[PDB]
Design a protein around this ligand. Structure first.
Ligand SMILES: CC(C)=CCC/C(C)=C/CC/C(C)=C/COP(=O)(O)O
Ligand SMILES: [Mg+2]
Ligand SMILES: [Mg+2]
Ligand SMILES: [Mg+2]
Length: 536
């Protein structure tokens, strides 16, 4: 058996994350100050007699500064009041902000709030083209539409062209904020990534900045960063003691990138256990993926697939030595999860993730069979298999394991492939297929998504990519609609799914692959989130 040649770049991080010793004095000092700043900020939110515009700008600022997770109740009460008073008498910037904040929080505010800014034709009044703050908030708002918001169909094009036109002559930091928004809208960005940018590049440089909020935002970001570094060290240790880097040398060494992904799903301190569980699963399914993609023979992958379905340590002997390694590691990981969830009486939920992993592996094997046969399925058949191979049903399920408040009913809802989950999975599938089409085509993978699309509909590569882009836009509208009240489960269990879609958009930004090639996209984010603190 002549295996393929090892082609993955080594981890670019070395051991720089392996050992992090927290300074308790600094941590305790930060925590104590934050407690005081947190109360000052609460009183700012609860101030009586504030105008609508000032209230919305305060909430927006606290959200972008990344400290809104301290004020979920206060912010919810205030937006709920604004939603129910149905105030509809403002300029474009307050109106667009009002619409975006309410929708992001699941309040189904009517899009008719935008009619007064449009002509008879439903097109935005071009006279608004010189109101840069209106255009900027309209722009951000355009990304939260559902299928019921066709009144906003023109908003992205309109605001984009006039923001591009205005940008070079804007003062700083507004210019940098506009320029940044045109590359990465807020609603589809990774929250920590956008927070780090806003704090350091924008709010820190605003003439009108509130000093209490800025100091609060920097201390809190740097304090949470200490936690993230501890987690990453603990996970780096775990990965090192498995030593796949030498026993399974065909496989990508990407535990830092995997941690960044888990950090994108949730950054808050109460999700520490959930993050560590999640990153271990992303790491491990990545190994399995490389086993199917870049090492195993058809015969070996069959045995591996069947062994996974039966899920029993008895089965290791049917496997080649090198597969014994990952298989025992997989089984042990899930035994660890059960043990770690035992004191909370939540061990029994691990089976939900196990069943999703089995599904991923079944579909991995189908994908291998297709490649070997030179099969090009129709799109419907392609999708029936390739949606699960995104791993996104599996990761979403995994993200619930460490969430203390996730119940059996939450897992039951997720097992039915709800619409919002399906949309998130679709976004991952079509964006990766658009970005990795050329490579996969070079490797002979004739069952890749865009190829299936071209052959099925009889259209060009360009037209197929346009069709996949439409699928992503439709899926984003479904995600946005999936967040609207009443939600089928607590919003706490929707946000991970939204954040999985965001991570996709951020990792494949401008359409190149970012996990297998972390040098382009992910490296700067990892440095800004997990290496450099924000200077105070
Ligand atoms: C499979 C891996 C590396 C999972 C861990 C990181 C992750 C969640 C990536 C996004 C999911 C996709 C689209 C993976 C594409 O794998 P293929 O090139 O088709 O074998
Ligand atoms: Mg792969
Ligand atoms: Mg694969
Ligand atoms: Mg791909």
């Amino acid at each position: 058996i002549v295996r393929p040649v090892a082609d993955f770049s080594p981890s670019l991080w070395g051991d720089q994350f392996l050992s992090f010793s927290i300074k308790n004095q600094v941590a305790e000092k930060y925590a104590k100050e934050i407690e005081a700043l947190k109360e000052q900020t609460r009183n700012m939110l609860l101030a009586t007699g504030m105008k609508l515009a000032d209230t919305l700008n305060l909430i927006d600022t606290i959200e972008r500064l990344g400290i809104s997770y301290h004020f979920e109740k206060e912010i919810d009460d205030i937006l709920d009041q604004i939603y129910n008073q149905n105030s509809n008498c403002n300029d474009l910037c307050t109106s667009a902000l009002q619409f975006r904040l309410l929708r992001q929080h699941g309040f189904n505010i009517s899009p008719e709030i935008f009619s007064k800014f449009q002509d008879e034709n439903g097109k935005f009044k071009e006279s608004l083209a010189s109101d840069v703050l209106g255009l900027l908030n309209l722009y951000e708002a355009s990304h939260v539409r559902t299928h019921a918001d066709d009144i906003l169909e023109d908003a992205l094009a309109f605001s984009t062209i006039h923001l591009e036109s205005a940008a070079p002559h804007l003062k700083s930091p507004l210019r940098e904020q506009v320029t940044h928004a045109l590359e990465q809208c807020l609603h589809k960005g990774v929250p920590r990534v956008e927070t780090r940018f806003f704090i350091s590049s924008i709010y820190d440089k605003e003439q009108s900045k509130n000093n209490v909020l800025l100091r609060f935002a920097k201390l809190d970001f740097n304090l949470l960063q200490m936690l993230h570094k501890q987690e990453l060290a603990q996970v780096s240790r775990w990965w090192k003691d498995l030593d796949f880097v030498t026993t399974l040398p065909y496989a990508r060494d990407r535990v830092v990138e995997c941690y960044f992904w888990a950090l994108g799903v949730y950054f808050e301190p109460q999700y520490s256990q959930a993050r560590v569980m999640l990153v271990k699963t992303i790491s491990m399914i990545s190994i399995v993926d490389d086993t199917f993609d870049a090492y195993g023979t058809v015969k070996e992958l069959e045995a591996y697939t069947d062994a996974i379905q039966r899920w029993d340590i008895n089965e290791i002997d049917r496997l080649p030595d090198y597969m014994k390694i990952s298989y025992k590691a997989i089984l042990d990981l899930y035994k660890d999860y059960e043990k770690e969830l035992s004191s909370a009486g939540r061990s029994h939920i691990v089976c939900h993730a196990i069943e999703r992993m089995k599904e991923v592996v079944r579909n991995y094997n189908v994908e291998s069979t297709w490649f070997i046969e030179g099969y090009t399925p129709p799109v419907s058949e392609y999708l029936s298999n390739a949606l699960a191979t995104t791993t996104y049903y599996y990761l979403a399920t995994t993200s619930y394991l460490g969430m203390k408040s996730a119940t059996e009913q939450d897992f039951e809802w997720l097992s039915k492939n709800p619409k919002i989950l399906e949309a998130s999975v679709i976004i991952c599938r079509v964006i990766d297929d658009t970005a990795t089409y050329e490579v996969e085509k070079s490797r002979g993978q004739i069952a890749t998504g865009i190829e299936c699309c071209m052959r099925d509909y009889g259209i060009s590569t360009k037209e197929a990519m346009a069709k996949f882009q439409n699928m992503a836009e439709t899926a984003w509208k479904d995600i946005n609609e999936g967040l609207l009240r009443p939600t089928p489960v607590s919003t706490e269990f929707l946000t991970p799914i939204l954040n999985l879609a965001r991570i996709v958009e951020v990792t494949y930004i401008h359409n190149l692959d970012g996990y297998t090639h972390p040098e382009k996209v992910l490296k700067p984010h990892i440095i800004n989130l997990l290496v450099d603190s924000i200077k105070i």
